[PDB]
Every structure is written in C-alpha cells, then in structure tokens.
Write a protein that binds this ligand. Structure first.
Ligand code: CA
Ligand code: CA
Ligand code: CA
Ligand code: CA
Ligand code: CA
Ligand code: CA
Ligand code: CA
Ligand code: K
Lengths: 238, 206
C-alpha cells in the first residue's frame, strides 16, 4: 500500500502543533549558560549510540547559541562578553536555524528559532555636563523661563529603551541654599525648563544653587534610577 | 492648577513583541491598545507614519488594531510599528516589533527547466542519469521538498530527498523510444501540503 513507509519521514518534524517558528524571550545581560529553549520538541533522537536524526545550528552569527542535541536544548554562550540590548551593541534579537537531518531518508528540515531580547533598566540618567548655569536679570518677571539648557540632548539622557529611557526632572531642597527650591520651579517635568516663581532682590541675594534630579520612568518604582546635578543661577544688575 | 499629564501605554507587548500570523484575514483584529491618563482624559489612538499605516488601522476610541491589507511573511516578515495615543493636548508614541507568523502557502518551484535527457539503450541498472531540484520558501516542513514520479515508473526511480533519477530496469529501444514522466515536488506540511509538477522527457538512443 502507498504511504506504508511514511513513518520513516516522521523524524525531524516537530513533535508539537502550532506555527513553524519557535519564539522565546530572555533578558538582556543574562548569564552564560542561561536556557533559551528548554526543548525544541523535534521528533527523533540525536546523539546516543543509535540516533535517528542529526541536529546542528546554522546562521549562528557570533555564536550566541549553543545546542545540546541529546536534550534538544539551546543555551546562551555569553562567556567574556555581555548580551547587551542598549547602544552600542543593540542586540534586540537573535535568529538561528536548527538543521535536522533524517538519517533514514536523508531529508533536511530547518527549524527557525527567534530569541527576543528584553530590555532591563540597567542604565541610569546621565548629564552631558558636570554642572549648569544661568544668569538672570533682577527685574525678570515671575513666571519667566530662566533656564532651558536641558533642551536637545544637552541635559540628561538614558540609553535604555521605552520608559526605562525617558527622563523626568525635579528640583530638590538644598539644605545649604534653603530658599532655592522655593524661588525656582520645574512645572513641566519632561522638559526640565526652570521658571522663576518669586521676585528676585539683588540687594539681598545674588546667587542660587538649585539641586536638580533626573529620574527614569521604569514601571517598578523600586527599579528607577536617578542622577543629580546643580544649576547655579547668578543675578545680574545690568 | 494641575498641569496636564500625558497618557501612557500599558500593554506588555511593547516590552517583548506582537505575533500575527500571515493568514489573518483583512478586517480582523490583531490586538487592542491600552492606555491610562492621570487626569482621566478620554484617549484617541492612532497609527502615524506611512508604511505601518498601510497594513494596520486602529479604531481611535477603543484602541482595537486591525488589519487593513494582507500580510505576507515571504514578502515582509516583520514590522516596527509606532502607535500613538492622545489626550487632546499632547500625543505620545511608542514602538513595537511585529513578527509575521508563517503558514504553508507556497508550493515548490522547480530549477533549470525544461527537463530532457538522452540516454543509451544499454545504460546499466543503477545508473544516475538526471537530477531534479525544487525549492520552497515556507518555513520548516512547509519548506522541505520531496520528489516522486506520478505514477511510479517500472524503469526509473527518483530519490525522494535528493532528486537523483536512476534507471532501475533494463531499457529496450524497440518497445519504447521516449518516456514522458511527471515529476511531483511536494512540501511536507502536516495539514496542508502543497505540490507542483514538471515534465521529464527521457529519450532512449540506440
Ligand atoms: Ca544593557
Ligand atoms: Ca537596558
Ligand atoms: Ca534607565
Ligand atoms: Ca492628560
Ligand atoms: Ca505568504
Ligand atoms: Ca508562508
Ligand atoms: Ca510550501
Ligand atoms: K533612550
């Protein structure tokens, strides 16, 4: 009968239903030997004294993946380097092929594996400069924006992706310049522009030290990173 | 006075990816965008940017994303798509990688046609005389090709994996001078195998 020997074509086919690609996700900077795929679920036995299949990896660019044929397990090979999703490495995904050769009949099937690398909040906000400065005239009206120096990557940036990499700025109380957080304000935390909120008086106070903290927007408040800088504001007479 | 707070997406797929099978019918929902706003503002969703917006539409009030034209994994197997949400004072956008899932929707295509070969009457049993090859761009078993004669021939066989054609019985010119055989190349998809036919002319010389 036709198709009596279709059993010999079974090896190398998926032992599961579902779509052909096998897609998984793991955290960036996962440790060497981290499991990527527990079981490829391919029919047949690789390795041992009487295998029905040969398994191996193709298009394993930079050798990120290691295969254990007997378990049909894929592992991260990260020794002496880190799986980094952030600039400059920018690895968002690893795609490899598991080649399976059916020993009995000689057919080859390629099983595609996509590994999606998930972003960690492993980077803090970073200020382009060690400190910032503004000069303001004494008759500046209250409500005037007196500092915009964080505009256009000149302030804090964070190399992480999404909210892990979005910044908010807030003014903190300065116990060595107590009135500075009362005299200046950041009403729009996303821009970090500082506005004057009390009338200045050059005859009384000529310099303010405004402590400004940038934070990122990680989902978990306990995983947020922060960094502080100082804005020194000098009054001018002319 | 409270300054406006901009809205933020909450879907967890933005942290990983979104899988959509290439056999999703046009008009079908693929996901729903979700967002919140500390001011309790009512939110309007969109898909800005030209390429993404040719494949994906979004119902502005609900965030239901739907498919505007067919996906084809063999043509384009992934998208990076920016979605937007707006509280009527600002817009924020955020990107997600969309992976297009494969289904077996191609039959194999043969290489180096047309197929014809002249062989001597005294060609010994076992002799390889011809090699057929076909490829198939679907993934997995849907991309792995098997060859056969339809129907099988008492005089020629074809290796199901390698497409090597051999003589398996002594030929005889006076009985048959030429054979027209049909070669079938099929993929190995479980539920919907697809296949293709080519002719192979075998001319026996005296
Ligand atoms: Ca990193
Ligand atoms: Ca990161
Ligand atoms: Ca960060
Ligand atoms: Ca709002
Ligand atoms: Ca297709
Ligand atoms: Ca396909
Ligand atoms: Ca196919
Ligand atoms: K960033």
């Amino acid at each position: 009968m036709q198709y009596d020997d279709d059993w010999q074509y079974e090896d190398c086919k998926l032992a599961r239903g579902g779509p052909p690609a096998t897609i998984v996700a793991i955290d960036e900077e996962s440790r060497n030997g981290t499991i990527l795929v527990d079981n490829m679920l391919i029919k047949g036995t690789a390795g041992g004294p009487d295998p029905t299949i040969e398994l191996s990896l193709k298009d394993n660019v930079d050798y990120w993946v290691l295969l254990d044929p007997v378990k049909q397990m894929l592992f991260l090979n990260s020794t002496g380097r880190v799986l980094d999703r952030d600039p400059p490495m920018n690895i968002h995904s690893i795609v490899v092929q598991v080649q399976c050769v059916n020993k009995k009949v000689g057919t080859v099937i390629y099983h595609e594996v996509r590994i999606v690398v998930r972003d960690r909040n492993d980077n803090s906000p970073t200020f382009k400069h060690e400190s910032y400065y503004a000069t303001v005239n004494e008759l500046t009206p209250v409500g005037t924006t007196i500092f915009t120096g964080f505009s256009g990557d000149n302030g804090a940036t964070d190399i992480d992706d999404g909210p892990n990499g979005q910044i908010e700025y807030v003014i903190q109380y300065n116990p060595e310049d107590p009135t500075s957080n009362d005299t200046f304000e950041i009403p729009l935390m996303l821009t970090g522009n500082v506005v004057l909120r009390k009338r200045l008086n050059y005859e009384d106070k000529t310099r303010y030290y405004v402590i400004i903290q940038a934070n990122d927007r990680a989902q978990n408040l306990n995983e947020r990173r922060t960094t502080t800088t100082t804005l020194t504001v000098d009054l001018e007479h002319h | 006075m409270q300054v406006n707070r901009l809205p933020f997406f909450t879907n967890h797929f933005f942290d990983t990816y979104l899988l959509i099978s290439e056999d999703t019918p046009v008009g079908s929902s693929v996901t729903q965008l979700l967002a919140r706003d500390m001011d309790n503002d009512p939110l309007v969703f969109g898909v800005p940017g030209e390429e993404a917006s040719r494949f994906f539409a979004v119902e502005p009030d609900t965030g239901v994303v739907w498919l505007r034209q067919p996906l084809d994994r063999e043509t384009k197997s992934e998208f990076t798509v920016e979605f937007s949400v707006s509280d009527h004072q600002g817009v924020i956008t955020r990107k997600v990688n969309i992976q297009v899932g494969d289904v077996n929707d191609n039959a194999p295509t043969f290489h180096n046609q047309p197929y014809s070969v002249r062989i001597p009457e005294n060609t010994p049993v076992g002799t390889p005389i011809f090699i057929v090859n076909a490829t198939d761009p679907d993934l997995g078993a849907g991309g792995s090709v098997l060859y056969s004669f339809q129907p099988p021939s008492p005089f020629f066989a074809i290796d199901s994996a390698r497409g090597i054609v051999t003589v398996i019985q002594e030929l005889d010119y006076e009985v048959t001078q030429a054979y027209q055989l049909t070669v079938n190349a099929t993929d190995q998809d479980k539920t919907r195998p697809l296949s293709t036919l080519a002719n192979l002319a075998i001319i026996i010389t005296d």
